[PDB]
Ligand binder design. Structure first.
Ligand SMILES: [Mg+2]
Ligand SMILES: [Mg+2]
Lengths: 246, 261
């Protein structure tokens, strides 16, 4: 069929956009065509793989669930950025800027769990007590908003927030706006993913590049080899306008 | 049959389709159908998304792109052609509401950021007709490209430089408006204190507290709902044909980006 099914979780979280563009840049020239299946609307149940199989795809890119994001399969093995390192970079950046009361907005995915663990480990290694919310649900803007308003009410001493991802950070930025907190003058916020949203002049969010372009590239090469290279890509800091020394 | 329905959209970067697909899903999945999305920028090397959709051998196809198994065009339509196989909001009415809102707020130097799509053309035409109906000379940029945030940003910076007298902007859609809001920020213009901006689509982005964008609800939920019912009526011609709305009414959603005078 020359069809490749690409599974993602939520169209509302644009972390996957340049990853699919990268996958496409590698696969389409080879004659392949891509179709997307999500976890919220493609089917009534919780069986996205069954939906993928119904199109009789030549291969599948799995960029959902909790494990390592992006796992290529023949028909019946993972490429991802180093989440521990990414979270370390984000946390260290806030520390180097002089922040002591730093909080983490967590998410319940596999990547989120790793970023949370790295956050705590990095804070303690640098002599600081970590603070995180207990939210273990999916990464959504609304939760980022209400979780941030709650977090800052309970801990007004917080001066910087490392959000597990960009979509959650959009919520945090909204919370800051509602609270009248200037970003970055009063509160620093750093996200993760470097989504197209973070790239806009309006949002202009400091974030950890999750190398989603590289992940899509190597994932595609790996799938092609089924139909050397590093399976763990390096993240990096992209400084924009949401962080400042303090 | 495969119980598969292919859904074609243009760009994942423009979230106008999100609640439309959710609505389509709410109607189709309980009946055993599964959905897969085909876009116009990454699903294939060329510009033949229909061929991509056909490769999965879908039972039906929802075409929500600006451009064989049974299909329904959702979110847009050919201004000339019949509406028998399309479900969309009334763009002329929506643009009229947006423009009239700015006019009723006391703005006279109103500008429109246009998009080159079928819906874009309709919104531009209505913008001009509404402005002239109220004795005002319409002003719009010349951009006839696709709806993307970056273009909204640079087009707005250029528009306001050429016409600093402009006090309000009716953006053809929300994603373009995000660019306009960024331009205002870059220019040091407070929204809405200095500049009013109204979008179109009521995207999830417009709904956030951070963006809090005044916009025209394109009834994308109603479109997805009726489009699903319409497609089902074609897939099962022997089953009773329900009451289907081919043209849904848009409405104004006031948030924080517009203000009087
Ligand atoms: Mg990324
Ligand atoms: Mg809508």
């Amino acid at each position: 069929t020359q069809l490749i099914a690409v599974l993602i979780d939520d169209y509302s979280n644009p972390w996957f956009i340049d990853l699919i563009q990268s996958l496409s840049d590698v696969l389409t020239p080879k004659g392949y065509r891509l179709s997307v299946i999500d976890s919220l609307t493609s089917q009534a149940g919780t069986d996205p793989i069954t939906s993928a199989l119904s199109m009789r795809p030549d291969g599948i890119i799995i960029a959902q669930d909790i494990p390592d994001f992006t796992v290529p399969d023949s028909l019946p093995d993972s490429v991802a950025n180093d989440d521990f390192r990414g979270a370390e970079i984000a946390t260290k950046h806030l520390i180097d800027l002089g922040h002591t009361h730093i909080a983490h907005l967590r998410v319940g995915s596999g990547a989120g769990l790793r970023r949370f663990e790295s956050f705590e480990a990095t804070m303690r290694a640098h002599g600081l007590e970590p603070l995180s919310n207990d939210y273990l649900g999916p990464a959504v803007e609304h939760a980022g908003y209400t979780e941030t308003l709650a977090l800052l009410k309970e801990h007004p001493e917080v001066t910087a927030i490392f959000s597990s991802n960009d979509i959650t950070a959009i919520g945090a930025l909204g919370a800051a706006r509602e609270l009248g907190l200037r970003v970055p003058e009063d509160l620093s916020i750093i996200g993760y993913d470097n989504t197209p949203l973070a790239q806009t002049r309006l949002i202009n969010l400091t974030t950890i590049d999750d190398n989603s372009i590289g992940v899509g590239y190597n994932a595609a090469l790996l799938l092609l080899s089924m139909l050397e290279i590093m399976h763990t890509l390096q993240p990096s800091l992209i400084e924009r306008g949401t962080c400042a020394p303090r």
